[PDB]
Amino acid sequence: MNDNVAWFKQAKYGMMIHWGLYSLLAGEYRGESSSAYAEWIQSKFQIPNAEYGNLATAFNPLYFDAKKIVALAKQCGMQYLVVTTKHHDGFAMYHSKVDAYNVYDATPFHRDIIGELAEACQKAGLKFGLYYSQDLDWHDPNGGGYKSNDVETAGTTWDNSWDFPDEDQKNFDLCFDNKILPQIKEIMSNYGDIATAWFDVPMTLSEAQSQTIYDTVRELQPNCLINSRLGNGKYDFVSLGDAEIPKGFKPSPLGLYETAGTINDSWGFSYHDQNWKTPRTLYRYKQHLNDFGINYLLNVGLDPLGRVPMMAEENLLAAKALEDEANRL
Amino acid sequence: NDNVAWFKQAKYGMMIHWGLYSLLAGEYRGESSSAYAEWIQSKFQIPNAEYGNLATAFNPLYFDAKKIVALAKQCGMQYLVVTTKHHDGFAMYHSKVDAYNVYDATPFHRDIIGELAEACQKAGLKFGLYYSQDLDWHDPNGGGYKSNDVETAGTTWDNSWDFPDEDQKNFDLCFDNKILPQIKEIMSNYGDIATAWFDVPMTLSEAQSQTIYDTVRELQPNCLINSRLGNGKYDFVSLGDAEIPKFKPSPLGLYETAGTINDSWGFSYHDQNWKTPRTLYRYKQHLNDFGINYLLNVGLDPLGRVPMMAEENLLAAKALEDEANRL
Amino acid sequence: NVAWFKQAKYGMMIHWGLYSLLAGEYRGESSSAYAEWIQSKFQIPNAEYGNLATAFNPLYFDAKKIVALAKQCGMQYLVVTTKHHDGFAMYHSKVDAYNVYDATPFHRDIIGELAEACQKAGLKFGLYYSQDLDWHDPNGGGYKSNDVETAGTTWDNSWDFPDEDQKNFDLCFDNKILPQIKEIMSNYGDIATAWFDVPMTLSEAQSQTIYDTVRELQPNCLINSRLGNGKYDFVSLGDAEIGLYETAGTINDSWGFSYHDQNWKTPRTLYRYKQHLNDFGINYLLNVGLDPLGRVPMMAEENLLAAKALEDEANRL
Amino acid sequence: NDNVAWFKQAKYGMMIHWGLYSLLAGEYRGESSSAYAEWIQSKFQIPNAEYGNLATAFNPLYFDAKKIVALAKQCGMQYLVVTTKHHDGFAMYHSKVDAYNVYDATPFHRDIIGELAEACQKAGLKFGLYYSQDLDWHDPNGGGYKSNDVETAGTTWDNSWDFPDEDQKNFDLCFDNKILPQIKEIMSNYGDIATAWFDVPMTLSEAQSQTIYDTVRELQPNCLINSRLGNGKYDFVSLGDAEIPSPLGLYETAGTINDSWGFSYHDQNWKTPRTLYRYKQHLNDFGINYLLNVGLDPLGRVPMMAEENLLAAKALEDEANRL
Ligand SMILES: C[C@@H]1O[C@H](O)[C@@H](O)[C@H](O)[C@@H]1O
Ligand SMILES: C[C@@H]1O[C@H](O)[C@@H](O)[C@H](O)[C@@H]1O
Ligand SMILES: C[C@@H]1O[C@H](O)[C@@H](O)[C@H](O)[C@@H]1O
Ligand SMILES: C[C@@H]1O[C@H](O)[C@@H](O)[C@H](O)[C@@H]1O
Numbered sequence A: 001m002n003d004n005v006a007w008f009k010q011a012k013y014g015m016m017i018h019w020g021l022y023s024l025l026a027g028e029y030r031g032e033s034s035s036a037y038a039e040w041i042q043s044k045f046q047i048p049n050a051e052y053g054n055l056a057t058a059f060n061p062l063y064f065d066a067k068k069i070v071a072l073a074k075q076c077g078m079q080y081l082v083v084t085t086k087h088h089d090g091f092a093m094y095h096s097k098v099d100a101y102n103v104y105d106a107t108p109f110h111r112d113i114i115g116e117l118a119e120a121c122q123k124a125g126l127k128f129g130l131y132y133s134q135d136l137d138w139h140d141p142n143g144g145g146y147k148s149n150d151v152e153t154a155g156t157t158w159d160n161s162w163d164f165p166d167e168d169q170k171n172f173d174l175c176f177d178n179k180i181l182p183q184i185k186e187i188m189s190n191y192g193d194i195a196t197a198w199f200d201v202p203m204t205l206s207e208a209q210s211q212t213i214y215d216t217v218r219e220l221q222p223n224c225l226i227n228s229r230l231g232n233g234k235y236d237f238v239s240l241g242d243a244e245i246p247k248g249f250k251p252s253p254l255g256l257y258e259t260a261g262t263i264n265d266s267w268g269f270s271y272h273d274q275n276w277k278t279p280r281t282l283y284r285y286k287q288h289l290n291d292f293g294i295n296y297l298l299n300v301g302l303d304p305l306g307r308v309p310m311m312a313e314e315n316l317l318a319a320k321a322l323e324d325e326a327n328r329l
Numbered sequence B: 001n002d003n004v005a006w007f008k009q010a011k012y013g014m015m016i017h018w019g020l021y022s023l024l025a026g027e028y029r030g031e032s033s034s035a036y037a038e039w040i041q042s043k044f045q046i047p048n049a050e051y052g053n054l055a056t057a058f059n060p061l062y063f064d065a066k067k068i069v070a071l072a073k074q075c076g077m078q079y080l081v082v083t084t085k086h087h088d089g090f091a092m093y094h095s096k097v098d099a100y101n102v103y104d105a106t107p108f109h110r111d112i113i114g115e116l117a118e119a120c121q122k123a124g125l126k127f128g129l130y131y132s133q134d135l136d137w138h139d140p141n142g143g144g145y146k147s148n149d150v151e152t153a154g155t156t157w158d159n160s161w162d163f164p165d166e167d168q169k170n171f172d173l174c175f176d177n178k179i180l181p182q183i184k185e186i187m188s189n190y191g192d193i194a195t196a197w198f199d200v201p202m203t204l205s206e207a208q209s210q211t212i213y214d215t216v217r218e219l220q221p222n223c224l225i226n227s228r229l230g231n232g233k234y235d236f237v238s239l240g241d242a243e244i245p246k247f248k249p250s251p252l253g254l255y256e257t258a259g260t261i262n263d264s265w266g267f268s269y270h271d272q273n274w275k276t277p278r279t280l281y282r283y284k285q286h287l288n289d290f291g292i293n294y295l296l297n298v299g300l301d302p303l304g305r306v307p308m309m310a311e312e313n314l315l316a317a318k319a320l321e322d323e324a325n326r327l
Numbered sequence C: 001n002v003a004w005f006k007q008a009k010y011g012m013m014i015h016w017g018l019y020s021l022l023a024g025e026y027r028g029e030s031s032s033a034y035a036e037w038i039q040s041k042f043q044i045p046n047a048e049y050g051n052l053a054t055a056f057n058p059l060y061f062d063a064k065k066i067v068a069l070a071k072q073c074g075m076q077y078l079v080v081t082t083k084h085h086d087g088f089a090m091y092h093s094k095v096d097a098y099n100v101y102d103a104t105p106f107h108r109d110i111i112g113e114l115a116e117a118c119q120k121a122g123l124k125f126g127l128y129y130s131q132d133l134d135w136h137d138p139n140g141g142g143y144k145s146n147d148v149e150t151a152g153t154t155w156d157n158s159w160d161f162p163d164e165d166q167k168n169f170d171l172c173f174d175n176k177i178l179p180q181i182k183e184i185m186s187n188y189g190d191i192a193t194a195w196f197d198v199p200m201t202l203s204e205a206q207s208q209t210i211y212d213t214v215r216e217l218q219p220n221c222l223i224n225s226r227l228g229n230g231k232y233d234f235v236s237l238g239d240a241e242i243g244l245y246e247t248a249g250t251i252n253d254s255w256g257f258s259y260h261d262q263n264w265k266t267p268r269t270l271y272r273y274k275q276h277l278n279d280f281g282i283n284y285l286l287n288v289g290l291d292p293l294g295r296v297p298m299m300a301e302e303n304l305l306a307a308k309a310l311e312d313e314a315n316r317l
Numbered sequence D: 001n002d003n004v005a006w007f008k009q010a011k012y013g014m015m016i017h018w019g020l021y022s023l024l025a026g027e028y029r030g031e032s033s034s035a036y037a038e039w040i041q042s043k044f045q046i047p048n049a050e051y052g053n054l055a056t057a058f059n060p061l062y063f064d065a066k067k068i069v070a071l072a073k074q075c076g077m078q079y080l081v082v083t084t085k086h087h088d089g090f091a092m093y094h095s096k097v098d099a100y101n102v103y104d105a106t107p108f109h110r111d112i113i114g115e116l117a118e119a120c121q122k123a124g125l126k127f128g129l130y131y132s133q134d135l136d137w138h139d140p141n142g143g144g145y146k147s148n149d150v151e152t153a154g155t156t157w158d159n160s161w162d163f164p165d166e167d168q169k170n171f172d173l174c175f176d177n178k179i180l181p182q183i184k185e186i187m188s189n190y191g192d193i194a195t196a197w198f199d200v201p202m203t204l205s206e207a208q209s210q211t212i213y214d215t216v217r218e219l220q221p222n223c224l225i226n227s228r229l230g231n232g233k234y235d236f237v238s239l240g241d242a243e244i245p246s247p248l249g250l251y252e253t254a255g256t257i258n259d260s261w262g263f264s265y266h267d268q269n270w271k272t273p274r275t276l277y278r279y280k281q282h283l284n285d286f287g288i289n290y291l292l293n294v295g296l297d298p299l300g301r302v303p304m305m306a307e308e309n310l311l312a313a314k315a316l317e318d319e320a321n322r323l
Helices: A004-011 A038-044 A049-058 A066-075 A113-124 A172-190 A207-220 A279-291 A310-328 B003-008 B037-043 B048-057 B065-074 B112-123 B171-188 B206-219 B277-289 B308-326 C002-008 C035-041 C046-055 C063-072 C110-121 C169-186 C204-217 C267-279 C298-316 D003-010 D037-043 D048-057 D065-074 D112-123 D171-188 D206-219 D273-285 D304-322
Strands: A013-018 A080-086 A127-132 A196-199 A257-262 A295-301 B012-017 B079-085 B126-131 B195-198 B255-260 B292-299 C010-015 C077-083 C124-129 C193-196 C245-250 C282-289 D012-017 D079-085 D126-131 D195-198 D251-256 D288-295
Touching: A004 A127, A013 A066, A013 A257, A066 A080, A066 A113, A066 A310, A080 A113, A080 A172, A080 A196, A113 A127, A127 A172, A172 A207, A279 A295, A279 A310, A279 B308, A295 A310, A310 B277, A310 B308, B012 B065, B012 B255, B065 B079, B065 B112, B065 B308, B079 B112, B079 B171, B079 B195, B112 B126, B126 B171, B171 B206, B277 B292, B277 B308, B292 B308, C010 C063, C010 C245, C063 C077, C063 C110, C063 C298, C077 C110, C077 C169, C077 C193, C110 C124, C124 C169, C169 C204, C267 C282, C267 C298, C267 D304, C282 C298, C298 D273, C298 D304, D003 D126, D012 D065, D012 D251, D065 D079, D065 D112, D065 D304, D079 D112, D079 D171, D079 D195, D112 D126, D126 D171, D171 D206, D273 D288, D273 D304, D288 D304
Parallel strands: A013 A080, A013 A295, A080 A127, A127 A196, A257 A295, B012 B079, B012 B292, B079 B126, B126 B195, B255 B292, C010 C077, C010 C282, C077 C124, C124 C193, C245 C282, D012 D079, D012 D288, D079 D126, D126 D195, D251 D288
Antiparallel strands: none
16 A cells, blocks of 8 residues: 555654755845745846856755754654755756766765765664656756746746747757656656655646656656646646635645745745744644644755755744644643 | 842843833934934933923834743743833833923823832732933033043933033932932832842942932832942942953842843834844853843833844744753 | 915825724734725734724824824825724714714824815815725725735625625615715815825715716815726826826835835935926825824934925025 | 055955855854854854864855955956955865864865956956955964953954963964964965955064065065055955054955944844945045945855945936046
8 A cells, every 4th residue: 555645644743855056056046035025036037057157067965964954854853854955947956877967976076965964764663755856957958937927936937948949949859858757767767755746836847748747757657646736637736826715716536735934035045034833833733733634844055065054044943832732731 | 038039049130121112213303322222312412401301202102011021931031120210310100309200291191110019929920220420411510521531322321411510410309309209119110129220320329329229128028139239238239241251249049130032222213133043042152151130121112112132032032041951 | 275285396205093003003914005004914803903992092183283284294285084994083063972082082183184274374174084994984985806915815894794795885885985985075274275085985966966076165175086996186197107186105115104115206206206296287195194192203204304395405506 | 566556446346255154154052142242252252163163064055256356347346356365264265274264174174365356367357365364263372362352343352261371372373373374374365465464463473474574575476465464464464444654555445234334134234235335435545445344144145235235326326426
């Protein structure tokens, strides 16, 4: 049986990690601010791939410690960790054989960060989940989003429209066949048992492309629960937006629910964003979600040195002290 | 006097700064107070006529002495120290000798010290009183007029704007007519006073310090007097931030450090620099480990409220403390 | 006023009311981003919320100094809340004693003092009025709209007045809304601009009656597009929607004063947004939320003056 | 020496703090620096082997000496003072005598002092140098080991963790082998130096202070020396905030925009444009130069808010001076 179903129902609390090249710019570019989402900075300022990709040469997070990050999650009662394997910028945070645009090949750090977090989660008894941008890829000429630019974004366009301005010649199929599916096979084959699969903004993928991803994860990771944002109705648990939380909606036939939130207002690390939700806010939101059978996936944006920001760490630990006190009395 | 043994093990107190300064909330005519919003009258040399008119707007509809004492109690605080009269010279109790007080001069028309005394008595918390015995900006002969060679959290130590003739200022007149009469009032009314919180005497003679000590002793035999009354007239030493382990003799081994949660004692809109729960708990643990009481200040807002972030950080520091003490 | 509005470029908006005294906080808990919605957010009974009037004594309120700040910043008009959703009038209303003149120790007509200050300085004067929502009125609007979330709880007062089936907005419209609109349009001289808000309950006919009333009493008053379908002179554009046009914004994230909101837009942000709007022929109406003492917050004033210094420097070079 | 007349009327300078400390950005293993993020090595007693490894991660891809000098110039600043070597003992120039420097030890592999010297020359700005002549946490005989009866923005004045034997310490060795050789390097290799910024001498003998003074005089005849080289060896007095003899009537007050000299992610306490302009006007009215510090971030950038507040202070100043 898949007892990840029963496990997910009672899991209550997860850590999400956003970490990438965007973390080095830290919500700032040439004296101007990112939107609230610092991880969208490449689109926000239309930073050419040649320049943005050169951030890889400065990626050397000397204080990255997968063990200490997992130990914080565990101390907070988090039962799983979801990490960005590849965000919208298309930079892989694992050793990708199909694309050299990755943290292993292109940075002096020269380490597989997904691998180190997979190993740390295994040793601590935490379940391990993977975030992958299956639609948007700003590094790929045929990256998705080029049909969706009638709606505003946390950057400029959904796609890379500056390096790749000819929208009528764009064919996502090529990106899907050559990068998206090959990379999904890599992350689902090389990093042990994957509990959760976190797909984002499905704007371009056909039904068939969503189905192919679903079928691939099922084959490689039989017990992996797929998030409702894969597109076109292919999933195991529903990712609820802030507006969808109890006081259209997606059916959840397994009754599995998760809301992702961040501690400040950005997913990626941002120097200027000190708007940290208080311990009381974190604990009360958690209790509310859990009471309605919804998992709280709570995001950390690691800094350029690979660190949990001091205030993210203090607020997580203080929320846990409030929770433990509330559960004793 | 088993207030001695009680004080030794008390570990944690609430301080309250509340006055007319609370209404300006760290801002005057588009400009900022210093870090100390309660010093705003001196900072901008606000004439007594104008500053005193703040009394007409003092109507804190949400002031609840019971809820304030319940917060202190939930946090493991064993006593409460409150400003009866700060440097501005505005009494926060019904003073018979001076009509410049919260009872006579405000539409609130209530004795706030009396309500806190009653609330502390019913909840079993010890009750302490802060009184500015030297500085009084409302009094023509208020102290500080000899000390203006050293900078302040305002301009001058004294009211030098309403009362500019520093030669033939005579503190004795303020001491005899306001300071000692008012100290007798707070120490006679309001029941048993556990702690007496005087401010660093800049103008007081030895004899004037002695007279205050002797008065508190007579009226409140078991009241512990803070070391800032004047040289050698005290029961416990008030240690400043700079005086804390990693100095005034304390023959009873009694020590207390006062601190605030943000950087101001009085309420300040613009000061959101709230010490984190971890900072509050760790500083408390450090002080207590050295046998020092942590007196932790709240600056009540214009409606008589504990600021939301002061209350959240106090309760979170308590949750961290309880968790640390179980494991 | 048509030609004048086209070239006006910059206005000051004022949110000021009983909500300003709670300042984004109630019994240890935060308002939403909108501190002026606090009564709905915590369902504060009218008896308690109304008692805030007894504590409304803003000793530092100075309409002359507020207009002088707007003028120094190159603002050519001022729009002020005469009555927000809570239903508390900030002028001497003859039809309702729930107003700043009758119910507060301040005992002054704040709209009157701003009207006089604007006239003497040569600034145009505009009026905000909540024609639909009124939390003080048993038949206040919004009781049909609670399928969509708000910056409080419900659109209406559903706590003092929980019987939604017995509610008839017509009664509120006839007895308070239209009488009060006649008062503000009759008693405070020439009104340049009329700022109505979310029409959720108003019939077409009720919107028409308001339009016709403002037209009669204030022939030259330009009406904002949020009165109701097709009854207006200029379009109020939201941030997402960016020949008369105006966009309203605030300096922090709240319209009413909120002491916990220190998220002040920088001078550079204020100037650049203004330049962008003006380049598209859109007026920037920029909101101040006055504090409990009637003051422009220190940081609102510093950022307004610094934005003006950046603007003047950019326009010289 | 018409640097004297020039300094009298200069009114406004940019200071730069930039080093390995900038990478930690006021945070170490989940704890905060003091208000001074540049003191982080002493604050947490970070061993030299670990702290020095920050050099391997120093790759500021957005460092642009021309854009930094252009900002200073737009703000009416007439000079730039930069940290050549702070207390940690890491040189921000290509030092021949010590390989513990930004050129030899970092992948950036560039002389940052040289690029700022060249940028200042081309823009017509005067160029000044900060050097920690007493404290050196990288040197076994670094100063401060006599001064630990007074508290610091870290722990000890000296490196007392890598070098705990205080009785075997002899500053003379550090002075002879690193301090004076390095002062000769910065005063020889980067063209005309207008200003020399030494820090309060705690360990230096009178003779060692004299030798520094005499060396700067020989190599840079027109260089004005700050009063924090020992008793009576200076050309202008560095006034503290609380102090607001000078036989040339030359005065300068240094301040920072937030509360830290080095970059600190957690310190968003930026003085407002109005505060910067009013403090400047006050200092200038008393004949005091305002030296205003920027702490560059790990990518070599002026923090967004430091740049916005500098430009807005200038707009307020220009407006005030027209009306
Ligand atoms: C968790 C969030 O999902 C969104 O759709 C993304 O666009 C954001 O970057 C973020 O990762
Ligand atoms: C507790 C504090 O003691 C200081 O010395 C006073 O000057 C402050 O205003 C405050 O009362
Ligand atoms: C200007 C804004 O318009 C909205 O409709 C209101 O609900 C807000 O409180 C504010 O007054
Ligand atoms: C300019 C400042 O004053 C001194 O030099 C140092 O102690 C500080 O870190 C900083 O360099």
